[PDB]
């Protein structure tokens, strides 16, 4: 059977009804060791375990694809116009930081 | 004075509050519900139970004719048959070939047995919810049955209190409900005048001694058999029999929220929904003065033993240095932690000993001792059965159960991503700066 | 099979229609109401009756000191005065001159009158409708009292009527009740144990032999008089009486759509608003066929009498020619006329006398007489009386008195200044065209 935080009861016959509750200690260690906390909190909170991941590692794509976004267009903002002369020559310290030849 | 707060309803586990006059001492109040009860307004309809066919007497004419004599009786058939020839234990009774003449005649009647052994079908509409409290207000301790409608106060000592009504109109009966024998059943019965052969209601009495029953048996007489004195009948069989061969459950086995359905009157009891609101109308002549009371100096609260089970698994020792030796309230105000006790008796130099119960893996509380706040602060450990047999002491808090590494790494994920996209912000702003500064020259 | 029709909530009419099954003869159907009730569930909660302040002898000592020992009675006041010389009537009762003792003790009881006059306070809700009809299905007459509800069908004769719910859940009683000797009043009472001094429940008696009366009468004990023995005490008066001083009328004399209250079981009577759904489940057997029936041909009406008044003062003729000699039903479809009786025998080439109730102020309705459609056609003209001592027998239709006159002042001065507008637009239009047509000369 399944028996939850809410309770559960059974009659066996003509015995008096025995009611059970469930307590919390799901398997695992919240103390560390980063596998072992989300098969605590899977155990523990199946249904938000799993969005909290979803929206955790959506945040952490979008957070990083647009400071990619962001820095590529600033390295392009700064060596597009020391490119568009026909002797180019970047100066040496922007050339070490933005990575030119 | 009016001091609003709001019970769960739910028996036999203590609900413990305390008023915070601003200048006077705190006043203790300790309500622990007993039994709540649930009482719907009940109808009787009708009443059923096993039927017995009477059947009359065969009356037979030697070379007649009979003619039906109506007696008006329930579901009552009368046929007249032709061409019989009876026997008794001493020969013949008639004697002619043809031409003799037999009435049979049969009814419905209830049972002998229908006094002990019969099923009654209410109706339920508009509960009246009722409650056994045991109030303690500033140690005057009553017992009292207790209404729980929004009025219909309990007195003592010049406290009136008032329990407000349920937030819920849940009830586990139906519309309809048929009583028998110690056990009640939501079953959608037909009506009076309205039952059907072989099922629930074929006989239909009013009340137990009404002398006036409905019957609709599909009772049809046969014809008796060759040299034989007696009345054949066939009808469709008992519908009440019928029905405790079917007879789905109790309500004390299906009902929802953990109730207990009783009959002396038709209740149910300790149900867990909803919640009942108080009402306190406290005078101005309990509130005793600060200074004659103890109030403490240089509190401090340890946490002994911590753990985040069911019942009261966590022990915190309070070392004080009180003004005076008496007894004090102790409270918690948020339900980050349900304390033990209401009350702790001082010495004046002593260590005080407080049992609570909480969800928190790092509980971090503030105590109200006397007058005084500390702030007992700590680490829960996990327990060891899986399946208790009493229920839960303590309140579900969202996120109650974090445990601070996992705080550090959602903080971790979620906050160096910002981190990462306000420096690229800025990284932007500053690059299109330098553009403009650049193509100044022009 | 199944009929749904409609009745109005009001006693005495007489309601008829008809069932027209589409190649059989016409089934007439009639309900007379009687008396309809409407019960409300009524739930009591004390009595109060006028009190009755019983003192006890007082107690002397001699150069002494008495002691107040409580005997818990209602609001038992007890006081002990001292300095006290009291006299009987055979000289002085002690020979000390001070330190003597008298000790005053008072108690409400309620009055010896308490069984025969006392006031029930109840409470009600969800009231039960219930009414006394008279119905009548094809010359098969029944009294029985029906229930209201949308279920608990009557039974005669194999037809099933379950007259349903009504369309309004109005009640004249409020959610609390007072009745005093045979009168029903709307009073807020307070609640058991909330009984004020000086107002209606300062005695609460839970019932009328309950032996356990909560009372507040403002009972004060005052100290007697030098050198009398009595027991002075000053105490509000009785608030029963002050309810019966004051007593806003009964709910007999102010309830709205002229109810008609009463007592022994509270119940009101007669209240004309709803209306009554019906439910007739018709077995096949009832039909009869056309030709088992008369049937007119070469039929005509004529109105005698035509008087818009409440009754039926309208008297319509109808020659007819039949090769039967029986009766027959006759119905307006409509709501024009209320026609007075639901047959009318016939002989073969005789005329019909029918009696009608109209609003209108030209009638035009189409009567139908036993199989087939005559129309009535006159002119009603208006009633002697302003003011009768019988309700009405008909329905107001909107535009029902708009009197043949008016509609030609109303199809002339609206419908003319139509024919002016587009009359206008005709010639705006032909205008335009014409000027299309002169400048295309160029």
Redesign the interface.
């Given at each position: 059977f399944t028996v939850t935080e809410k309770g559960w009861e059974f009659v066996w016959g003509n015995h008096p009804p025995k009611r059970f509750w469930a307590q919390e200690t799901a398997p695992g260690n919240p103390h560390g060791l980063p596998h072992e906390v989300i098969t605590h909190y899977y155990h523990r909170y199946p249904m938000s375990t799993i969005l909290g991941l979803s929206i955790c590692a959506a945040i952490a794509t979008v957070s990083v694809a647009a400071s990619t976004w962001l820095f590529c267009r600033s390295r392009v903002a700064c060596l597009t116009p020391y490119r568009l002369t026909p002797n180019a020559r970047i100066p040496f310290c922007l050339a070490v930081l933005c990575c030119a030849r | 004075y009016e001091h609003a707060t709001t019970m769960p309803s739910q028996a036999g586990i203590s609900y413990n509050t305390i008023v915070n006059r601003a200048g006077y001492a705190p006043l203790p109040i300790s309500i622990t519900p007993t039994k709540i009860k649930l009482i719907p307004?009940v109808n009787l309809e009708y009443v059923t139970c096993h039927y017995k066919t009477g059947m009359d007497s065969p009356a037979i004419k030697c070379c007649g004719s009979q003619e039906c004599t109506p007696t008006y009786r329930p579901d009552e058939q009368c046929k007249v048959f032709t061409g019989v020839y009876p026997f008794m234990w001493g020969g013949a009774y008639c004697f002619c070939d043809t031409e003799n003449t037999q009435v049979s005649k049969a009814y419905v009647m209830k049972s002998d047995d229908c006094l002990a052994d019969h099923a009654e079908a209410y109706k339920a509409?508009?509960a009246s919810v009722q409650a056994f409290l045991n109030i303690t207000v500033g140690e005057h301790s009553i017992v009292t049955t207790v209404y729980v409608n929004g009025?219909?106060?309990?007195?003592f000592n010049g406290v009136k209190i008032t329990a407000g009504p349920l937030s819920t109109a849940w009830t586990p009966f139906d519309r309809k409900i048929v009583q028998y024998a110690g056990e009640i059943y939501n079953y959608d019965f037909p009506?009076?005048?309205?039952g059907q052969p072989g099922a629930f209601g074929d006989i239909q009495s009013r009340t137990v001694s009404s002398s006036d029953l409905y019957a609709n048996t599909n009772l049809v007489l046969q014809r008796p058999k060759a040299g034989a004195i007696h009345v054949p009948y066939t009808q469709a069989p008992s519908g009440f029999e019928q029905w405790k061969k079917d007879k789905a459950p109790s309500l004390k086995?299906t009902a929802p929220f953990?109730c207990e359905i009783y009959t002396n009157p038709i209740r149910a009891e300790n149900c867990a929904v909803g919640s009942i609101p108080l009402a306190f109308d406290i005078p101005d002549a309990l509130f005793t003065r600060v200074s004659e009371t103890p109030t403490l100096s240089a509190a401090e609260c340890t946490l002994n033993e911590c753990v985040?089970?069911?019942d009261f698994g966590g022990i915190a020792t309070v070392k004080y240095s009180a003004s005076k030796s008496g007894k004090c309230a102790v409270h918690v105000p948020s339900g980050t932690a349900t304390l033990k006790e209401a009350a702790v008796e001082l010495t004046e130099q002593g260590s005080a000993t407080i049992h609570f119960s909480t969800?928190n893996?790092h509980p971090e509380f503030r105590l109200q001792i006397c007058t005084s706040y500390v702030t007992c602060k700590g680490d829960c450990h996990?327990?060891?059965?899986?399946?208790?047999?009493?229920?839960?002491y303590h309140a579900?808090t969202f996120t109650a159960?974090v445990?601070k590494?996992?705080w550090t790494?959602?903080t971790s994920?979620?906050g160096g991503?910002?981190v990462?996209?306000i420096?690229?912000?800025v990284?932007?702003t500053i690059?299109?700066m330098?553009?403009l500064t650049?193509?100044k020259h022009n």
């Open positions: - | 307004t509409h508009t009025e219909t106060p309990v007195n009506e009076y005048g309205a086995f953990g985040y089970s069911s969800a893996i996990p327990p060891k059965d899986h399946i208790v047999t009493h229920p839960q579900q159960a445990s590494t996992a790494w959602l994920l979620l991503s910002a990462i996209i420096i690229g912000l990284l932007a690059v299109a330098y553009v650049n193509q």
